[PDB]
Amino acid sequence: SKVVVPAQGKKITLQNGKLNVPENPIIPYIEGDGIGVDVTPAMLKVVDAAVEKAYKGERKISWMEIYTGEKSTQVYGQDVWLPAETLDLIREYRVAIKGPLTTPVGGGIRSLNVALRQELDLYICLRPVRYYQGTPSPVKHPELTDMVIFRENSEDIFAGIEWKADSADAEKVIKFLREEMGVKKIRFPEHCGIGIKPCSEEGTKRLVRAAIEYAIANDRDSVTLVHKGNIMKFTEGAFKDWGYQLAREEFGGELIDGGPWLKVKNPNTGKEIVIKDVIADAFLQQILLRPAEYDVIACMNLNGDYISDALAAQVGGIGIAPGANIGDECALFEATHGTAPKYAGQDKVNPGSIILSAEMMLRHMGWTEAADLIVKGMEGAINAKTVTYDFERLMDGAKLLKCSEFGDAIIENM
Template sequence: MVQEEVIIPYIEGDGIGPDVWKAAVKVFDAAVKRAYGGSRRVVWKEVLAGEKAFRETGSWLPEETLEAFRQYRIGIKGPLTTPVGGGIRSINVALRQQLDLYACIRPIRYIPGIPSPMRNPERVDMVVFRENTEDVYAGIEWPSGSAEVRRLIEFLNSEMGQRVRPDAAVGLKVMSPYCSKRLVRMAIHWALEHGRRSVTLVHKGNIMKYTEGAFREWGYQVAREEFGDKVIFEEELRGSPPRGKLVIKDRIADAMFQQVLLRPEEYDVLALPNLNGDYISDALAAQVGGLGMAPGGNMGDEVAIFEATHG
């Protein structure tokens, strides 16, 4: 029997990453052997990022690592160091932006026997689609007192009629129709293909009307224009949804945190902007046993990199 080999790049990660990888790779190899009866195996190709990459190459994220992911189109990674405050920007964010991994997909479901702080963690069964490339996570920001921020504050105050303190640090919250729509489109596609019940657009549009509020409107637009015969909107419901129809609804982000605690069975697939998606996916992971219990896939149209959910 000729054994088929598949090459998958991996980053073992920083901190406990190498220890986790040593245990995880044994599980992966055993699962592949069991699934394919020995006819296939994974050849694991190490690529560098984070502290190990910096020690060995002088770069936190070498170009060779990005090229390997582009070539093989799939990868897996451990946690990577992100200093709080000054220092390097997030390597995780850089991977997502440079490879255009625009959707962070996190399925969150309780595994029986895992300790949980909840009385009924089995009520949680959701898949989070988090936009991965925009919002405040884009890293467009300037430190207090810098020449750049002084010019920006001067423009905002003199030209745009704002009242920003001269000693402020400033970051931009960038959200576009293109990136928001493709995220919602992927969430609806996935929900339809997997027979899920609903997609909920989670946003803070009551306050941030032109960014988060626009995310809501763009999401409804995608649902209406591209999936009109396959979806039904919550306000149109009269009792149970028609058979085969996917329910589209939305919730304000802060209220949604209460909803996932008190009424988790009412929610199925969630689509969110970047920052809120980070918060709510971590909170849901805590309900089923902790951050490490929730897998995550960072996916684009050409490349996907998988990881454990972590803070």
């Protein structure tokens, strides 16, 4: 039923991992709710301008609006938050980009952000954090952070397997645990909520295969597995040991003096790449105290939420962190931040997050030149101290811009 597909426009296809991208591709976008209505028109305007500039008119994206969240009940009936159509269309057109979504409390509907991250088996959440020169940071040295986070998106506590305290189904499970498994370490059995965290060999090896093939393709110095595997041994600890098994078995890892750390040679370059582990709690400290030691980070779903959002804040970026969820059959690039409805409609928020998830969308397609021009413009707009609420509420001798006008500032700087 009612979504409008373009006339001038052809669709992206696959041919084993490598995808065939037309001169005139159809790219789906979901507006987002709240500030989605402000930031998405600006993201469309600078991507279009960056491809006019780089390819001098040969290439053009035909943009196709698809629906999720609030904006979808308005179009299809107040109870459908996620239309099956949207799922069949990202799988078919292969790359899409979304603005913020937040899910309603009241219907026992789970994070829409996360129902898509998994109904489409988009198992890699990739969030790069670098310092853009000139951003207000709270830390003294934010320039040392050039990290790339690879977060497992189909597992962990984040999958949604849990039952309400005192419910039918939850008591059955505690009877099963005390009686048939011989478990005495639940301090209080009565009026207790239980949740399940799973971690599989297959599930973690495809995230670490993905993170190490990225270290190779991009001349990167280290791959740090972070985990709290000293207390959660068979989930998170199984993840560091399966992650090191895979760098031995598929990549020819060798030891560094007496372990535990391994060496991988970069086939294309000859630099030695390091495969190390740091307990997740000690890692939260090591990112503030010693950030140049780490580059690519691989980890399970919950820790990656945490490290991204902690690193993003440290470099000045809550409002500008990019994000992609990449799978085997398709990818979805998104704004990382909330919906923020207090400020929606009145054009003020920073659109950098969704614009930089678009630089990412563009180099995924292999339109590196348009991607590199969007990061030239963002680097300039910011250096020109010509900026938006969030960066001016914190900076001296800067000029204040609306969301519209900041997009224009990025174009002006290409």
